[PDB]
Amino acid sequence: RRRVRAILPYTKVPDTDEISFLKGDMFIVHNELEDGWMWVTNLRTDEQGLIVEDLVEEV
Amino acid sequence: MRRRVRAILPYTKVPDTDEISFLKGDMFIVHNELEDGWMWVTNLRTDEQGLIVEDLVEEVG
């Protein structure tokens, strides 16, 4: 919880609500789901979507 | 991973069950789609995880 930053880029799986992102991107966490998933907002693109904890780090 | 769906109508869970209550407009992240028409999801407004019927939701985006 707080603001997390992508440690690597990521391209979403089609037909899911995952969002693609680039390394360095900052996110605000809205919900922390089971199995490391999170519903967030990417501050660069303003897109809302799912991202996994394995690809981000606390700021 | 997967997708988000939205409630088109409200629903009050049967007491003491794994169903969850929700309001029209609530957004859910789908974890499992059960062949019996139900699904295991998480309500993003309440953060509750449980069962909901697919007939009360619609696809988003």
Curated annotation (Swiss-Prot), chain B:
UniProt PTM: The N-terminus is blocked.
Cellular localization per UniProt: Cytoplasm
Disulfide links within the chain: none
Residue stretches making up the SH3 domain: 2-61
Superkingdom classification of source: Eukaryota
Tissue expression as described in the entry: In placental villi, detected only in the trophoblast layer (cytotrophoblast and syncytiotrophoblast). Not detected in stromal, endothelial or Hofbauer cells (at protein level).
Transmembrane residue ranges: none
Purpose: Inhibitory regulator of the Ras-cyclic AMP pathway. Stimulates the GTPase of normal but not oncogenic Ras p21; this stimulation may be further increased in the presence of NCK1.
Subunit structure: Interacts with SQSTM1. Interacts with SPSB1; the interaction does not promote degradation. Interacts with CAV2 (tyrosine phosphorylated form). Directly interacts with NCK1. Interacts with PDGFRB (tyrosine phosphorylated). Interacts (via SH2 domain) with the 'Tyr-9' phosphorylated form of PDPK1. Interacts with tyrosine-phosphorylated EPHB4.
Disease: Mutations in the SH2 domain of RASA seem to be oncogenic and cause basal cell carcinomas. Capillary malformation-arteriovenous malformation 1: A disorder characterized by atypical capillary malformations that are multiple, small, round to oval in shape and pinkish red in color. These capillary malformations are associated with either arteriovenous malformation, arteriovenous fistula, or Parkes Weber syndrome. CMAVM1 inheritance is autosomal dominant.
Protein name as catalogued: Ras GTPase-activating protein 1
Upper taxonomic lineage: Eukaryota, Metazoa, Chordata, Craniata, Vertebrata
Name of the gene this protein is made from: RASA1
